Amino acid sequence: DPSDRLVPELDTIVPLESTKAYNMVDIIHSVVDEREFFEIMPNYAKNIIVGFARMNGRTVGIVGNQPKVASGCLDINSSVKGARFVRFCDAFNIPLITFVDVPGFLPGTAQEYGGIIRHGAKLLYAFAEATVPKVTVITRKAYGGAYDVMSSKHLCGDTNYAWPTAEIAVMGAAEYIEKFANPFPAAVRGFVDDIIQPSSTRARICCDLDVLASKKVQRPWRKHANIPL
Amino acid sequence: YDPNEKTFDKILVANRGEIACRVIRTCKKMGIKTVAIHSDVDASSVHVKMADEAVCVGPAPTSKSYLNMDAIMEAIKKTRAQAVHPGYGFLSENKEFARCLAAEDVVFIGPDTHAIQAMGDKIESKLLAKKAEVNTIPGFDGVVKDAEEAVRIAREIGYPVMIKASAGGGGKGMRIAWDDEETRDGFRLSSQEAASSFGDDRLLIEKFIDNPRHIEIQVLGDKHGNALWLNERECSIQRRNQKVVEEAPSIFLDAETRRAMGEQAVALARAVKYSSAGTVEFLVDSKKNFYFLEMNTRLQVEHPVTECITGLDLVQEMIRVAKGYPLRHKQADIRINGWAVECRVYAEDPYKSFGLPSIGRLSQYQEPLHLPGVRVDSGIQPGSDISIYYDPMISKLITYGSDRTEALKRMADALDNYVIRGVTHNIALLREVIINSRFVKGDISTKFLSDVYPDGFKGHMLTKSEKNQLLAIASSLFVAFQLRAQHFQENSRMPVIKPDIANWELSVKLHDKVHTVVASNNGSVFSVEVDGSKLNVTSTWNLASPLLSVSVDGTQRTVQCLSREAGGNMSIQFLGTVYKVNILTRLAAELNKFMLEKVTEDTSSVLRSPMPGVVVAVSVKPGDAVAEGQEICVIEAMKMQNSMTAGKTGTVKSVHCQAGDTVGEGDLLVELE
Amino acid sequence: ATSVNERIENKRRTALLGGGQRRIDAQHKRGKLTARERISLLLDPGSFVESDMFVEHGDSVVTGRGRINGRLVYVFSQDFTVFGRSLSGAHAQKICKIMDQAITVGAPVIGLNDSGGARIQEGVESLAGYADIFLRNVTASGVIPQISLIMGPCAGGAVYSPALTDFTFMVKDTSYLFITGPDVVKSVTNEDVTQEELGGAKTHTTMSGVAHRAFENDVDALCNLRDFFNYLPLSSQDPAPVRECH
Ligand SMILES: Nc1ncnc2c1ncn2[C@@H]1O[C@H](COP(=O)(O)OP(=O)(O)OP(=O)(O)O)[C@@H](O)[C@H]1O
Ligand SMILES: *C(=O)CCCC[C@@H]1SC[C@@H]2NC(=O)N[C@@H]21
């Protein structure tokens, strides 16, 4: 499987209407080697997707939002499911690839009483702690603190890319919408490295995984950290 | 393609799909600016991309986008298009469109409104043909109002009776009848369905012809009275009265009959004052007696094959005729060059009623453009989706050769090298048809699919040698995957000790039988022992490419590995048909013998709503048989709408969640079996 | 002849005492103190040393260092009550720099969160600032102790910073912790709930398990915070504190 293979089928996979959803597993299958994906917890917390795949023959971990289920919103179960997988991938030098289409956290008194703050902070910590190479692609949406948790603004994401249909809005929704109906406000402030065509996605990621294989960072000494569990 | 001959400057193609792409291509070859009309869902289609400029015309439904005549006229006015090309279908047969275009300022690339009106109605066409001294299908002239008139006129014409609905078409509103009670009941129900759908309610009685051969003649005429016949075409392999396989030179016909049919078609075209490209269709019996049947006043879908054997670009000639130039070819210039065969690759399931429309999005699409003597006409690209609004036709595949055998061989090779992943297609049916013994011999009729597969399409019934080759290929692929699984990079801390296995003993389950296979690897060559039969399989064993070319005992075979699981399941497209094979090791099979079979009735007979939300509308109607994976209704929650499928496989008895029903999570939605 | 000398004094008096007495009185009638009053109560008398007194005229946050019972600590206190419109980049930059200094020297961080006055109402660099704060909280986890005292309503991604800290304390009847407001809950979930029910101190100290303790008011909370801080070591490089015993 050549690392420079184009994926034109991803050029129109994201619908123009934000009210209409799509399947992130299709994108994951299109990007990875031989379209082979080992999904972890496929039938639990279906609003998030985690699994193992290969890029250029190297094992990679995949985390992504699923707009089909609960509009891709994050909650307690998806938070912990993604967090432990990210921690395992970081603990064994496995690079992470993230696909971001999260509109925020699931509201309601059940989530608040269940401790949505702690469980969300678990995913925040898991992404902010990883020292492995990490590549992030924003497909359509990234709102609120959900934008920050899914590897955005320097606590996670060595390279960040946005599709032409991607957009970041702190409070989504005439003159103001046109300004923030595009990732240009993100690009001008250096939020994302570039705006790429979907067809090049795989190739880009492969190139990045070659450069970041020798990434080393230094952190202050500690016996261990305090997980927000 | 001489550019010195001045032609129109701007042409607007009022169509979509592959015909729009073909028209845009032939206009680009002629140095003409092109305007493409499109709907919202087609804003990223291929013909929009290859056009000079594009205009959005309306929403997804065809009644509001490709039939909204006011919108097309507004687009023409705002783009100042000199000419308009309707392709086939849509508004190509609408008198009002041509009348308005000729009224305002627009020239219409097609037949005049007089010819379209003359040949629009079947009764008028038949009477005009009878007045045009051409052989016609024998029957009673006039409109039948009651079934008793039908039976009395069926007394003398013959026992085989056909009930036909005037005008319209598309293989609908037409039926057969044998008995007199059959005559009444068929006439009554045909009148009912014509009132329901057609609305004309005009029915006619015809003498059915057994084992008919559908032969078309492509006529081309200018406005100066010249008329030419461009050989013939054979379109006999049909289901639902719709053609799938077409053949340019008629093997059944000879020179004299072809010349007579061409002369009759030219005479009919002159009588109707045709001034464009059209086709006249005939039914030929066993004794070579052709009878007229319908005239298409537009470009046929299967026109490329007669282009291949004649070397003429039909759309270019149509444009030149519409400009006013005379025909640049004489009847003696027309000649037969080689042989041509075309198949219609549809997005349909051939195992159900010889084709049932299917929907989906194309994850992978690769045409065999690098093969010798192959031409593909498609408006389809990777990522395109097959919606319900338009025809589920993926592509048209044409192959040409020096003779019939070379063309058929090249067509089989092209069909075996055609990658379509995302929807279900009918490539298996086409490949089965083109390699059939009867099709090769040439004794075919319109009931070919009816009698070759009386119980329906079942697949490719593979022989013993083919079964051995398939088993050897599957075993070799399994062993190649296992061997690739052992190729890690050097660790330098814990070196990998590669196992030195020499023989792989495998149990391969195919259909319902179990075979014992012994595989050995010698570099790039696999020696395979299947039930005592020895075969050699060689290939590059590239496990990532969609197409794999292998050589089994010197025979070259192209196979596709559609799916593969760690449990041993594997789907292989071989000779055009998809086979499921389960491959295990001998120890694995022996231990699997102890596994208990689990009944797969599943749970949750009542479907549970995944999220609470109201239903804007219901796509399907209660009483329709559906299965799991087919969308039923659209439920909106958190300002996002999901068109979820049926929870359990069963017919939709009743949609409990109608419009305005705010159904909660985990609740009954649709009564299913 | 330059008026810089009087301009500096005017800016100092504007930062320390605010533009006017209006909203400080308004805070007083709600039973809450100001950021500077809270800092003065928390730290030893005369030990506070402020940093970045002059950043885009304000900042709705007061950061600095001080001593508790003679031991060094770094503190920040939010002052969003009619003192800042949006939680701008200056806010997060000051918090990040004070946390960086605390990590550099090896001293704990205490944060008083009272982002009530103006929540955001506009900001794109705001999420960036909280992303930086989250990164520095995760970096300091297990290196220096981190204490959060919520003394007012906190909403949005901000609430994730106290969650990453080691200990979280709340003030009864005046502090709230919730990702999404009650009005959005009504709009989406279609249920009636108040701020106290959704994210009050009792909810987060009895049901959700988010906060660790609750206190009666600001003075009691700060006294108990000093008492609790007496227990902890300054860094993970230090042994457990040993006091004299009787
Ligand atoms: N009189 C007949 N005897 C036998 N078969 C017939 C007769 N009339 C029609 N058929 C069958 O019906 C098929 C289609 O006929 P016809 O061209 O009239 O239909 P249509 O739906 O109007 O066509 P189109 O879509 O090309 O306009 C023929 O190919 C043939 O198989
Ligand atoms: C609908 O009434 C508008 C509010 C929903 C906003 C969406 S859904 C929940 C997520 N949380 C948030 O702040 N935005 C997202």
Ligand SMILES: [Mg+2]
């Ligand atoms: Mg016809």
